[PDB]
Design an enzyme around this catalytic site. Structure first.
Site, PDB file in Angstrom:
ATOM      1  CG  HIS A   3      26.068  51.693  44.379  1.00 15.94           C
ATOM      2  ND1 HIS A   3      27.421  51.980  44.499  1.00 15.94           N
ATOM      3  CD2 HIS A   3      25.532  52.486  43.430  1.00 15.94           C
ATOM      4  CE1 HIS A   3      27.663  52.917  43.591  1.00 15.94           C
ATOM      5  NE2 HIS A   3      26.554  53.270  42.946  1.00 15.94           N
ATOM      6  CG  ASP A   8      23.182  51.925  40.834  1.00 20.75           C
ATOM      7  OD1 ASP A   8      23.955  51.589  39.881  1.00 20.75           O
ATOM      8  OD2 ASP A   8      23.263  53.022  41.415  1.00 20.75           O
TER       9      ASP A   8
HETATM   10  C1  LIG Z   1      28.991  55.872  41.955  1.00 21.72           C
HETATM   11  C2  LIG Z   1      29.601  57.149  41.384  1.00 21.72           C
HETATM   12  C3  LIG Z   1      28.995  57.625  40.076  1.00 21.72           C
HETATM   13  C4  LIG Z   1      27.786  57.123  39.606  1.00 21.72           C
HETATM   14  C5  LIG Z   1      27.233  57.585  38.427  1.00 21.72           C
HETATM   15  C6  LIG Z   1      27.861  58.587  37.696  1.00 21.72           C
HETATM   16  C7  LIG Z   1      27.236  59.120  36.452  1.00 21.72           C
HETATM   17  F1  LIG Z   1      27.396  60.408  36.314  1.00 21.72           F
HETATM   18  F2  LIG Z   1      27.712  58.585  35.375  1.00 21.72           F
HETATM   19  F3  LIG Z   1      25.955  58.892  36.399  1.00 21.72           F
HETATM   20  C8  LIG Z   1      29.067  59.093  38.164  1.00 21.72           C
HETATM   21  C9  LIG Z   1      29.633  58.609  39.330  1.00 21.72           C
HETATM   22  N1  LIG Z   1      29.574  58.270  42.378  1.00 21.72           N
HETATM   23  N2  LIG Z   1      28.378  58.713  42.924  1.00 21.72           N
HETATM   24  C10 LIG Z   1      28.663  59.612  43.869  1.00 21.72           C
HETATM   25  C11 LIG Z   1      27.662  60.242  44.805  1.00 21.72           C
HETATM   26  O1  LIG Z   1      27.301  61.554  44.408  1.00 21.72           O
HETATM   27  C12 LIG Z   1      30.071  59.795  43.931  1.00 21.72           C
HETATM   28  C13 LIG Z   1      31.012  60.587  44.691  1.00 21.72           C
HETATM   29  O2  LIG Z   1      30.696  61.412  45.540  1.00 21.72           O
HETATM   30  N3  LIG Z   1      32.358  60.385  44.385  1.00 21.72           N
HETATM   31  C14 LIG Z   1      32.757  59.525  43.410  1.00 21.72           C
HETATM   32  O3  LIG Z   1      34.022  59.488  43.151  1.00 21.72           O
HETATM   33  N4  LIG Z   1      31.928  58.789  42.697  1.00 21.72           N
HETATM   34  C15 LIG Z   1      30.613  58.916  42.956  1.00 21.72           C
HETATM   35 MG   LIG Z   2      25.339  52.522  38.654  1.00 17.48          MG
HETATM   36 ZN   LIG Z   3      23.234  55.064  41.055  1.00 16.26          ZN
END
Ligand SMILES: C[C@@H](c1ccc(C(F)(F)F)cc1)n1nc(CO)c2c(=O)[nH]c(=O)[nH]c21
Ligand SMILES: [Mg+2]
Ligand SMILES: [Zn+2]
Ligand SMILES: C[C@@H](c1ccc(C(F)(F)F)cc1)n1nc(CO)c2c(=O)[nH]c(=O)[nH]c21
Ligand SMILES: [Mg+2]
Ligand SMILES: [Zn+2]
Lengths: 348, 343
Positions: free
Chosen positions: B83, B124
């Site tokens: 992040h 973020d």
């Molecule tokens: C920070 C989190 C996340 C942010 C944001 C949203 C939404 F959809 F709500 F915007 C969902 C999830 N995030 N980001 C990724 C990168 O692609 C991943 C990942 O690969 N595996 C995870 O378990 N969590 C992840």
């Molecule tokens: Mg966020």
């Molecule tokens: Zn983000």
């Protein structure tokens, strides 16, 4: 199902309202600033002037250089923004706003909150049930209403709508009472109005309850931002349930209004083929027991926390407790379910 | 778990606005990997994208103010593994890709597309490398300020964005009318709050219904729902790139998540399995995340925009790649060197 039809007077008196200037509060009534005043006694046509009178007496008009014609128009738009169900009407918003004024006058809120927070609390009181339909949040979801479609994922369906209606009034030409505020202060006002109105959802109150108890236990800290926000939530809920702090005649009449409204929702749910909550079913509801439960588990704890934070609020808690005792007396001389056939509790 | 703030321009004033093809001939393609751009060239690329979408001219944005705003947003991110500013930059680039490849102008108002891009840059801000549950558990000042209303971090990201707008000489919307200025704040609030996965989970059925029924440009709620969908597709856009990108982003995500789990253990609390380097099995967790979270977002995008089909196919392909490589990944957590190169 006709008793569930509650109309809007217009769509989402002005010069007449300001013709003789703003009335000093003592000219409205020598008892206007007392916890023994019953604002539901004021004629409905005099309520808009009383709102201006309270804002003048709290020095908000002068301190914030509020344009009086804009404030008069805002007040009339808010009043016209309520429908006519038995309880959730303009006289309820007016009575809730009057209680906010009483807290300012009796508890010396300026020693606990910022001026902008007290101002937002009072405006939120006026707006807090705007466009209420005489139904609760669960009904919005069940009836697949436009309001549930817009807000149900986030909870507080009606409260999010009340806030949205308040914003729509501010956005109406000639009604933005604080459009002269700085960008920072205008944003602060909107954030405060959102938080305070959303605090009127009982589900929100129950979620923050342990935090309110913790604040009352450790003691209020005027330098603690979370304490200011928790206190505003507590004060808002105390304004919303303030009919319970009045005399027996008021708590008895408000039970009549609450249960007429709740039972009309129950009848509407039965018409839709659904089984309503027990408190909304005129065939299952036993009003003295439901009233005693509401008083002991919802209203009395709010006034007990208020007394814990403000010793001068002890008389409010005592009055709520006395009204609960009066309901216990009624329960040994009330042998019916729902309301009587004539919809009156006057015989009590 | 310590991630710093760098603080509390001439190069951009001289050559900040460049034609996008000079940055890369593939800059406006879904196969461009924005994390390949050197960090020192990202502010120039932000200005170049805003110029290419014609927002600078159309909204009469003061370029020195825009350069200062971009620099403030970049300095607003800390340095956790995932992040950080490069994440915000890559999310912003994907928003630009949706504009260039899909016919966004045929679905949303110019102001809503503009708010989506600025929200991507800010979404973020000041992230601490910890999730919302951690804010509550650690009894943080952010949780004290926002937990009662929901989406602790997302409310903070929006507050940080507003604080930048309120900073001397950084207000890119200064000359907007009072009504348009307010519209920008409302859009930024709604779009940034849409990045909380809890919010996405709550509105999924309504997104599933808008795609089933068909997008209606005259329906204000369809515009709101679409913006939520688009914002989440930008946030997860690393999953639409090549296998090397997906693998590297797993290294970053889990190094950050495992640092939170280590911190929770130090506080005497048991972390969720996915944040626990002693329990988490990355391929299984990623297959679940791609099946339940990423793939449905891109499938919805494909349903609304036919040109988005390649995005969903790439996400599905990357999920299949995790299944195939799981036989070679025989451990919980990450290797001693935090690298997945061995795969
Ligand atoms: C920070 C989190 C996340 C942010 C944001 C949203 C939404 F959809 F709500 F915007 C969902 C999830 N995030 N980001 C990724 C990168 O692609 C991943 C990942 O690969 N595996 C995870 O378990 N969590 C992840
Ligand atoms: Mg966020
Ligand atoms: Zn983000
Ligand atoms: C509308 C509801 C109500 C509003 C608001 C909040 C709070 F606290 F969350 F703000 C709680 C409850 N309400 N109001 C009254 C008026 O005394 C009564 C009553 O007498 N009996 C009830 O069962 N419910 C009542
Ligand atoms: Mg209400
Ligand atoms: Zn109310």
């Amino acid at each position: 199902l006709s008793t569930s039809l509650y109309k809007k007077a217009g769509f989402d008196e002005y010069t007449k309202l300001l013709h003789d200037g703003i009335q000093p509060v003592a000219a409205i009534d020598s008892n206007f600033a007392s916890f023994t005043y019953t604002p539901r006694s004021l004629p409905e046509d005099d309520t808009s002037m009383a709102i201006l009178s309270m804002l003048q007496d709290m020095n908000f008009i002068n301190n914030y250089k509020i344009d009086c014609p804009t404030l008069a128009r805002f007040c009339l738009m808010v009043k016209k923004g309520y429908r006519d169900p038995p309880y959730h009407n303009w006289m309820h918003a007016f009575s809730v706003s009057h209680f906010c004024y009483l807290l300012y006058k009796n508890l010396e809120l300026t020693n606990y909150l910022e001026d902008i927070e007290i101002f937002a609390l009072f405006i939120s009181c006026m707006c807090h049930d705007l466009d209420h339909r005489g139904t609760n949040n669960s009904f919005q979801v069940a009836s697949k209403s436009v309001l549930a479609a817009l807000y149900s994922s986030e909870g507080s369906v009606m409260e999010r709508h009340h806030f949205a209606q308040a914003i729509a009034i501010l956005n109406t030409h000639g009604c933005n009472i604080f459009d002269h505020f700085s960008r920072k202060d205008y944003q602060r006002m909107l954030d405060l109005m959102r938080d305070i109105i959303l605090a009127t959802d009982l589900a929100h109150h129950l979620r923050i309850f342990k935090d309110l108890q913790k604040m009352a236990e450790v003691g209020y800290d005027r330098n603690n931002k979370q304490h200011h926000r928790l206190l505003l939530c507590l004060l808002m809920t105390s304004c919303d349930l303030s009919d319970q702090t009045k005399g027996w005649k008021t708590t008895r009449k408000i039970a009549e209004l609450i249960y007429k409204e709740f039972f009309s929702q129950g009848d509407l749910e039965k018409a839709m083929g659904n089984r309503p909550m027990e408190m909304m079913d005129r065939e299952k509801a036993y009003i003295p027991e439901l009233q005693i439960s509401f008083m002991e588990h919802i209203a009395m704890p709010i006034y007990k926390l208020l007394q814990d934070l403000f010793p001068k609020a002890a008389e409010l808690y005592e009055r709520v407790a006395s009204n609960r005792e009066h309901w216990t007396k009624v329960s040994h001389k009330f042998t019916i379910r729902g309301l009587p056939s004539n919809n009156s509790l006057d015989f009590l």
